[PDB]
């Protein structure tokens, strides 16, 4: 039964964008609906964030604290003074101010997105010791984000996320791929990469880098620009992140909260072939993860990297092993679900079986009651109790 009335926000990964762009045409829902839409008809009240996709995790993370109480992005001082990009973004309004105000919410992320969760719940509580630092050192302001302390969010859930990184980074062109990746997005939602659009569209939100597309170039040339850029060329990157060292990284510093409880989703749309080990594209997969990206993810090993057999099942990006929460580098406890979610542990919910783009409907599979999940997740973010009780 319903036992809390926190606030979901749906938070989209490298690849994603706001429900104004691409035409209307949703990430959360793709081409099955809109998911925000039917958890707020169905009485879960919802809302969706837009942040930087291709953007490192922190800086998605400053973003997305902006977004939720309003104000100017800031990036802390330290971090752009390290990274040489901007100390301040963009400006917002702020879609919860019921959060400055003692009210939680409940965080469902997908790919990427379930980093930045994570990582916005650890500045969010313990801040960043080193902002604090070079803001006394310096004589500069300070972030609230930085300062730690806050108590905003009742449980964080992941779906196909790289928790350890996948080893799509590691492909030798992944650069073009993972643009063509970009663009195989594009067109799932009627949208080509040829042509020089004078709306928007599609919004990378780089203010920081001061990239932005620009008249009469169409996204197949902004793409060449940007992977020449600092938000493909730096580390302060979702392609670093991402990565399995960056990934590991990532796990060193950001724990989970004991204050939070943490769900995650796997899914895999693969086979095993008997004779070499590797794991092949299951028919009805996304086409352009089933010819450029899931045969390297199912056959890529690299023994000093520590990728073995069992990062071979994938969903035709990420790996399925790297999705039950952070294990390379981290100290967080992963429990099976047992019919109990836990706070401050992953309670690893299983596997599923849908590819990276069919889990939120932008790649169709009429055998996933895409309805049924989201109704069926939201139900039991519902039910979790803020401070419960131990009992026989
Ligand atoms: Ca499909
Ligand atoms: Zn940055």
Excluded at 141 to 151: A, C, I, K, M, T
Aim: charged share 20%; net charge neutral; glycine share 10%.
């Amino acid at each position: 039964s319903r036992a809390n009335d926190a606030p979901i926000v749906l938070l989209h990964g490298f690849t994603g964008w706001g429900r104004e762009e691409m035409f209307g045409f949703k990430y959360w829902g793709g081409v099955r609906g809109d998911i925000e839409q039917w958890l707020n008809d169905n009485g879960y009240r919802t809302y969706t964030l837009a942040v930087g996709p291709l953007s490192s995790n922190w800086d998605r993370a400053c973003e997305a604290y902006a977004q939720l109480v309003g104000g100017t992005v800031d990036y802390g001082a330290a971090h752009a003074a390290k990274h040489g990009h901007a100390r301040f973004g963009r400006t917002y309004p702020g879609l919860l101010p019921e959060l400055k105000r003692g009210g939680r919410i409940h965080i469902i992320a997908h790919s990427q997105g379930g980093q930045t969760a994570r990582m916005l719940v650890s500045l969010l509580e313990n801040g960043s010791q080193e902002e604090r630092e070079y803001a006394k050192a310096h004589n500069v302001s300070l972030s609230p984000l930085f300062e730690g302390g806050h108590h905003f969010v009742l449980s964080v859930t992941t779906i196909a996320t790289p928790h350890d990184g996948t080893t799509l980074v590691n492909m030798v062109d992944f650069t073009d791929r993972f643009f063509d990746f970009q663009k195989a997005v594009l067109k799932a939602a009627a949208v080509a990469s040829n042509v020089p659009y004078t709306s928007q569209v599609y919004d990378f939100k780089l203010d920081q880098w001061g990239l932005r597309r620009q008249p009469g170039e169409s996204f197949d040339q902004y793409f060449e620009r940007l992977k020449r850029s600092p938000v493909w060329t730096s580390t302060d990157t979702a392609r670093y992140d991402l990565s399995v060292p960056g990934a590991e990284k990532l796990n060193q510093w950001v724990k989970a909260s004991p204050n939070t409880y943490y769900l995650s989703f796997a899914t895999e749309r693969t086979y095993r072939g008997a004779l070499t080990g590797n794991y092949y594209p299951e028919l009805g997969m996304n086409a352009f993860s089933a010819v450029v990206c899931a045969p390297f993810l199912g056959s890529y090993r690299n023994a000093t990297l520590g990728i073995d057999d069992r990062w071979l099942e994938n969903d035709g990006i990420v790996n399925a092993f790297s999705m039950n929460g952070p294990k390379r580098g981290s100290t967080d406890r992963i429990v099976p679900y047992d019919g109990t979610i836990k706070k401050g542990v992953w309670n690893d919910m299983g596997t599923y079986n849908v590819d990276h783009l069919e889990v939120i409907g932008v790649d169709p599979n009429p055998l996933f009651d895409i309805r049924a999940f989201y109704l069926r997740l939201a139900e039991q973010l519902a039910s979790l109790q803020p401070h419960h009780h131990h009992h026989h």
